[PDB]
Chain A
Amino acid sequence: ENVLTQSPAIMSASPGEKVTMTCSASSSVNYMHWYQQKSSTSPKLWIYDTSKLASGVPGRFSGSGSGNSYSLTIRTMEAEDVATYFCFQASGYPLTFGGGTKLELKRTVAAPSVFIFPPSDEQLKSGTASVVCLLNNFYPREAKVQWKVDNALQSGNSQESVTEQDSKDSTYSLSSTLTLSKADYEKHKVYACEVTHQGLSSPVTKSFNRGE
């Protein structure tokens, strides 16, 4: 098969900035096509036959290339262009897709707002205590969240999940969920999550004491 290589796999651009993503075919093709996919919903046809825009695609997009060498360009990056772009060839079977280039919007630094949630009483009756730390609306993506229970650093008992870049404000949000047995949850007093992020002069700590 005719392997298509898109590198770099991830790039960022500030608003207004020109961006160019490449696609290399191992074997020469007469035409290259491209798709845009936002957040695991159906891809959309974006450019066909190397340089033709599909319907609904704004004029700031263009495509070029020939032989083994193709590109897609955005004249001026906008927040709505945050997506994964896939090249695709249909000149020979099997039909093949590139691995994707995910394009991020590089906006200004924004500090998370941090919230801590204790387990619900309803959950505790079941025998488990999930404690949630929420980092809301921050940029850039890199952030460290540590859980501290009566001053001891937890490890191996928490999981993080992160949103995609928000449509309008280009920020992330992040949850961190500490799971303990009820018995262990009742053995300790102070539950703290500690957040380190380049928007904060020093770490933020949000805590509670089980009880109220």
Chain B
Amino acid sequence: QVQLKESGPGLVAPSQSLSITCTVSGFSLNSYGVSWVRQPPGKGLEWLGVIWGDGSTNYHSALMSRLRISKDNSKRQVFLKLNSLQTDDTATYYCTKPGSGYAFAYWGQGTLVTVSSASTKGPSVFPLAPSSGTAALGCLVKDYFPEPVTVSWNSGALTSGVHTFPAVLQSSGLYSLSSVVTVPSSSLGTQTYICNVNHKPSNTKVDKKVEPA
């Protein structure tokens, strides 16, 4: 179990800098390189750079010298620093370990970085109430920033028939999404349906009970 994990700030203002830490385990940074990759939302993978076990570095010239990678072996940490972020630096950032064929054998979970001067805002949560053998209900999660929010149903116990839509960025600069679940008509009197909405950037948790009108 080689593991890597990114920690980073989430929101960064334009022209300010980005720092992310990659904390590793199951391997020694003195013997192995660590690469960095990003993915702009809805787009492809792009390589950023590498620090090798000896501490030597290589960077993508498309970053025009804005990127430095460093590491501290005893702390099991690799540091990425990217200066002067602009809007097009918005991406999910991954650290990765080259392995077989010098391809990226192990990846962190990624950390979303949003480049924006706009401020954090928690969502409003509204019920999508079942109509008058299958019925649908849901929650509308409106007017938050930045991504992401998570939505679970009944604390994660209800998973079958759930569809949580991709968030859309509105004109306002805020995001919205709906989460729905189809359930048996016969459960509507009986069963409790709670959408649990968590928006970590604002420290907002909302549990919204959804019942017939």
Task: Name A's B-contacting residues (CB within 8 A).
Answer: 31, 33, 35, 37, 40-45, 48-49, 52, 54, 86, 88, 90, 93-100, 113, 115-117, 119-120, 122-123, 126, 130, 132, 134, 136, 159, 161-163, 173, 175, 177, 212
Please, which residues of chain B bring their CB within 8 A of the CB of A134? 136, 138, 178, 180
CB atoms of A49 and B100 under 8 A apart: yes
A42 to B188: give the CA distance in the assembly, Å: 38
**Nearest-Cβ distance from residue A130 to partner chain B, whole angstroms:** 6
Tell whether B118 is near chain A: CB-to-CB under 8 Å: no
List 10 tightest A-B contacts by C-beta distance, closest first.
Answer: A48-B101, A33-B103, A49-B101, A42-B107, A161-B165, A95-B47, A120-B126, A48-B103, A173-B163, A48-B100
Task: Assess whether B92 is interfacial by the CB under 8 Å rule.
Answer: yes
Contacts of A177 in B (CB 8 A): 140, 176, 178
* B170 contacts across to A, CB distance below 8 A: 159
Interface secondary structure of B, over-half rule: strand
Which of A43, A49, A212 meets B45, CB within 8 Å? A43
Chain B 25-56 near chain A by CB (<8 Å), digits 1 or 0: 00000000001000100001111001000000
Q: Contact partner of B166 among A43, A122, A161, A212, CB < 8 A?
A: A161
CA distance A26 to B60 in the complex (A): 18
Which one of A43, A136, A159, A175 lies within 8 Å of B182 (CB-CB)? Answer: A136
